[PDB]
Amino acid sequence: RPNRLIVDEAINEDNSVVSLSQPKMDELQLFRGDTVLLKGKKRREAVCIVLSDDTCSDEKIRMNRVVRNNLRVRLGDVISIQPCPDVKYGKRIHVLPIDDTVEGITGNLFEVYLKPYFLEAYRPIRKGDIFLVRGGMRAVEFKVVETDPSPYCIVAPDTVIHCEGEPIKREDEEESLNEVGYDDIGGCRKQLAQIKEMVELPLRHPALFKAIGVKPPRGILLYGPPGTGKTLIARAVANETGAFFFLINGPEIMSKLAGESESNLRKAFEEAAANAPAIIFIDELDAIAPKREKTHGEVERRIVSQLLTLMDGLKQRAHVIVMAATNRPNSIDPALRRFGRFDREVDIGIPDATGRLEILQIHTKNMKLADDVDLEQVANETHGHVGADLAALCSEAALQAIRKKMDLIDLEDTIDAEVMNSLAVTMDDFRWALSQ
Amino acid sequence: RPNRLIVDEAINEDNSVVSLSQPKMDELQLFRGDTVLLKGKKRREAVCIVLSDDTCSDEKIRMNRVVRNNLRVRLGDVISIQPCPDVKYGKRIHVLPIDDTVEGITGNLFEVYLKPYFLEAYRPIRKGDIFLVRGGMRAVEFKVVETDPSPYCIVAPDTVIHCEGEPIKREDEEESLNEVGYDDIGGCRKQLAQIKEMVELPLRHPALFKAIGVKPPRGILLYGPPGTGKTLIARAVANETGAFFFLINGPEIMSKLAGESESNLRKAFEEAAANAPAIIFIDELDAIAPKREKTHGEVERRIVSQLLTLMDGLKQRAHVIVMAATNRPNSIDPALRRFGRFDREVDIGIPDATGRLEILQIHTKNMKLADDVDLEQVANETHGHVGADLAALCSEAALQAIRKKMDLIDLEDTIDAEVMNSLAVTMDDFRWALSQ
């Protein structure tokens, strides 16, 4: 059908906007800025604004996770689109925050989140939507409980927005937007793309490997210096593909008594296989399986052997992918790179200046930046920096902003765990941080 | 006398401004902005504008080299000051460029240098003054041939400025401002101060060491990575103290036939001693006298020996100081760090961020910078950089400015060796250079 499209990653960071190719909108007869009605899985719908995108495939639609969540679908799934000509300016909408996103937040909610979020934006909303509003170094989720023209409308300047009391509980299928996704990863476009390919069939179409006798990858080794976002990638790939995630921390395993280590490795692979499709992530692999000579222990050599055995003991394995992070290829036992094991490697390098910028935007999404803040500038003075450095930078900048305001606040009493929304991080804060 | 002051270095880079202490100006009854007549040696006079400096001491006057040259005086000499209440707005002045400063310059001298230099500035000038105007990546010197009033006047908006044809020859005592001076050295405050102490008496008061039997330093070893400005320091100290300068380049000596090396070392010390007070600078000392083991030759060992001999053969001498540069203490033969020889060592380190800024201003003095150019910014993104790096940076910036304008210029014909005065180096040029 022409109205069926494949879900793809957003370029436009605004949660209300989905993107089509110029040709596709032509074909579907959709106006730039039109309100469209999206149909997903489990009888879910979403309403969004449609815009053209030059880079979008003709058969794909780009949407943010917020809308993917609302439609209960994942990247690569199929949605249907159709114009929404009947959509009315809403008389009144009722929204409530999800409890787990508003712990600690002692603000107005309406004045701090909702009012600025909706103001003059003409956002469409549908009853039962969860949307996200960022601010005050948090990101709060709200559920739309009622819209006056039901079940959807446009929040126009005259639309009354109600949020009368009592945060609501999170239902089971409602994944938190605080979960890691691809949108949380900057400057890895190329490698993240490879990893997604490798994993697509095994994790999203597992039934295939029962129907054919072709071998998908089993083990993927992510290498690169500390703080490059290897843990982040693995976690994200799991979340996005809806696979079960099992973390094995090198040091955590090695901290255990001889024997309770091997018992823990075993339990990890068993639990993965039980909950497949699944990803096992082995953080700090070199702690567990260092270069064959670097081990001096005898229990140490037994642990690495136990790991090789466990890798080999993964056949079709239902559909379990093992991902592991390490500093360098040569830091680990070469027997791990043997064929049935870690046979795929991906280099997560130091980010470039464009990547640095993406990372800086990711780690500032929930801050209020002054107008004088130039992230591209901060990008340019941080050549050596990896993701973890940049995140620390933004964190140091923000905490400096807070200290500057803290003497002022203590004196005219201590609003303290508030006023963090009116606070803005200035370029002076970043300079301060950049020289520390 | 209170009209008698010691010549010190300038903080204001205007070559028309001389700075005194509030108290002294009070004492001498001088108005901030007043024209003062300065008297020095060889019956040379100079008219300058007097301002105040918190750092200047009551006994000292701060002036730029331009004015020290005009007064035939050097740092530490004694000048006399007096108000100039009779000074008139000039009717007409006549100036000519010094030939050696205008080779290659195919501009309109008046339109490009003189007009902007004098315009609305109210500069005093005195017949027989040489002044310097910077611009178009050059610095041109002019001599004042005639002033209408008297021997001096103020160049007021109505003063007619003549420069009718024919660059003039440089007289003997007229030192080029293209010579290296302390104003060409950035970010060495502490060390430059030590070296100046060491040579003050030997080079400026040589008659003393005939009257007493105390030993001044003979050899000074400047240490630090390449491009830190060791050659520059030695050259500057020579020029400023009026001493004779003799360069010995390590590689140049070692490039000679066995025997012509030793003959060249000898000729260097002989010529120094003949023209004392003098500085001998040995650039790249480790090329001539490397660690005792690093030499393999037999003629090589003869050269090092020859050097030890020559230096130990310089007692108070005709007042000859020997300076030598090397990367590290340990790179050279320990016998050279002897007691009658290189017994004083001074570390010329990597410059800090303040130093980096001074260097960047030094290497931009003759460029036109756009308003968007922030040198302090360039200072901050060049931590590792040494002076030689920063000079290359400015050079790369300027050449990029020129290339951008070169396509445009070739097309609407090729002013070429001109229009370089209207050209301005932009922050975009520096960014381009900073990422290369």
Place this chain on the structure above:
Amino acid sequence: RPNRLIVDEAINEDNSVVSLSQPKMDELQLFRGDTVLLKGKKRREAVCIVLSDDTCSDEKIRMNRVVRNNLRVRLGDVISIQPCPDVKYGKRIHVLPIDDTVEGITGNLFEVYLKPYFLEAYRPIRKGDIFLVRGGMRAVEFKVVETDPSPYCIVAPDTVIHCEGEPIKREDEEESLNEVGYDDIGGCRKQLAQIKEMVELPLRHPALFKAIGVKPPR
């Protein structure tokens, strides 16, 4: 001022073709496939076929070295372009090989080089042009001695193409196309670009470094 362009490297490997930006041809009112007259240094002219190029800057013209040589200009120099509406199918042209390019060649020059080179191609040529024909693991240069409609024409199927023996000597300013050029360097795009930058001002505008005191790389 609109007809003056900056010489740039060829993308189209055919020595007859120069390339302009789409906008520029619009501006100059030139037909795709038109014969154009190029004016260079030392009162030299060339005639070429003009085609559009999407990647060519609006102020630049792309040409192969053959044409740069004929115009006595180099990359970055300035030429002028203008349409050539009067150009006629030539009755007869006379070409001779340059001696130094034909030592050892004991072939039929016409049958082996000229005939295939001109055949049904509609190449424009101007008296005093040197052109290059490749073949038999060698590349021969020819000089155009005479064209019937003088001084330029199109070599049409009916144009009689004469050699008439006796290779000619190479004049001084006539650089061999056997010389190395950027044309003979593959797979160095990025680095060749850097080196060209470094060297541009010092080598092509040397008069500058007498006028200013900035240091180019050495």
